[PDB]
Chains A and B, each alone.
With several copies, the nearest count.
Chain A
Amino acid sequence: CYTRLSHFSLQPKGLVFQAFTSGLRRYLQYYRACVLSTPPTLSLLTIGFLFKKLGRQLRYLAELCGVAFPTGVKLLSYLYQEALHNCSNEHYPVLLSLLKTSCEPYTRFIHDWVYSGVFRDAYGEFMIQVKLYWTHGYVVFLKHIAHDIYVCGKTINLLKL
């Protein structure tokens, strides 16, 4: 499954999928760092017992990915449901560290309409795309702010004109 992970997460379609793919390699290097530091030459059973509390987590990461797969707000919310799903167990910090960097460009997209108002789109990962002037079509996170972002951007885009 380690070889099945390097085959799947080698590329640098979607930008948040790129962010998640680059966050996975932040962890696989730690998996390569904890190995090959402690044991020069140990017993056989010490290896099977030492890599048991860690290796089953590496098999858990196979059922997380494919080895289809969503993209955009769909992926960013699926990975969120995966958290409350398996919260109190030992899979909280790894999934949380993946979610903390898998949302990182999406916060820039949100950080446009609040500060600058320059709407940025690449492939449609944003939930919103682009007389009357108000035809920016709109239609997980709390919906108490979701509709508010949509008008908080359009007020700035009206004041620019």
Chain B
Amino acid sequence: MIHELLLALSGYPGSIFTWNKRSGLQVSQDFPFLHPSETSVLNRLCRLGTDYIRFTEFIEQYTGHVQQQQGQGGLHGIYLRAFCTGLDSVLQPYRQALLDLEQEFLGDPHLSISHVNYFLDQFQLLFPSVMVVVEQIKSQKIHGCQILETVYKHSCGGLPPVRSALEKILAVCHGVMYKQLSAWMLHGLLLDQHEEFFIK
């Protein structure tokens, strides 16, 4: 729960922090040796691990899909494939901050959860903000270039870390937009299966 917590926040659960597909990471709430207050701090940290397990499951599942053997992106195809390649790179400092926690707990044998809470309360904000960016794409079956608009309407975010983190994703998938445009504007041929780039 000092190493099991870094392991469960790494996305590998364990039967203290019981992974449930409904309740994400869930402490099992009845313990005679710890007590209800640290349980609440553990639940508060398990929100981040729940979001991370759902993010990694979405990235593993919907790479758009694997070698692509009906397609729409994340059901098969390229623009949301650029979205997930942006998404794991955006989630990278959370991994590296966890690895830095591991070295500090390697150095000192007794560090608090309030120590971990203060170090990870900057990702405690960024994760629920990008959850809605993924959720609109899943719900409205957002096909092709409308993902570009969907991340841009939240690139007017007003948490400045959230604005910059979504800007990185927009630059990445603008990469594949510029890639298709440098084919049709330059060599005269479209290169699009079932996704589009605003020219029929």
- Interface set of A (CB-CB < 8 Å, partner B): 43, 45-46, 48-49, 60, 63-64, 82, 84-90
Contact = CB atoms under 8 A, between A and B. Distances in A.
22 contacts: A43-B99, A43-B102, A45-B7, A45-B10, A45-B98, A45-B99, A45-B102, A46-B99, A49-B99, A60-B66, A60-B67, A63-B66, A63-B67, A85-B67, A85-B68, A86-B68, A87-B191, A88-B78, A88-B82, A88-B176, A89-B81, A89-B85
Q: For chain B, which range describes its interface: under 10, 10 to 19, 20 to 34, or 35 or more residues?
A: 10 to 19
Contacts, number: 32
Interface in B1-50: 6-7, 10
B194 interface: no
Contacts of A63: 66-67
Given A43-B102, A45-B98, A64-B67, 6 more contacts: A45-B99, A46-B99, A84-B191, A88-B82, A88-B175, A88-B176
Interface of B: 6-7, 10, 66-68, 78, 81-82, 85, 95, 98-99, 102, 175-176, 179, 191
Contacts of A49: 95, 99
Contacts of B10: 45, 48
Contacts of B82: 88
Closest 7 CB pairs of A and B: A63-B67, A88-B176, A88-B179, A45-B10, A60-B67, A63-B66, A49-B95
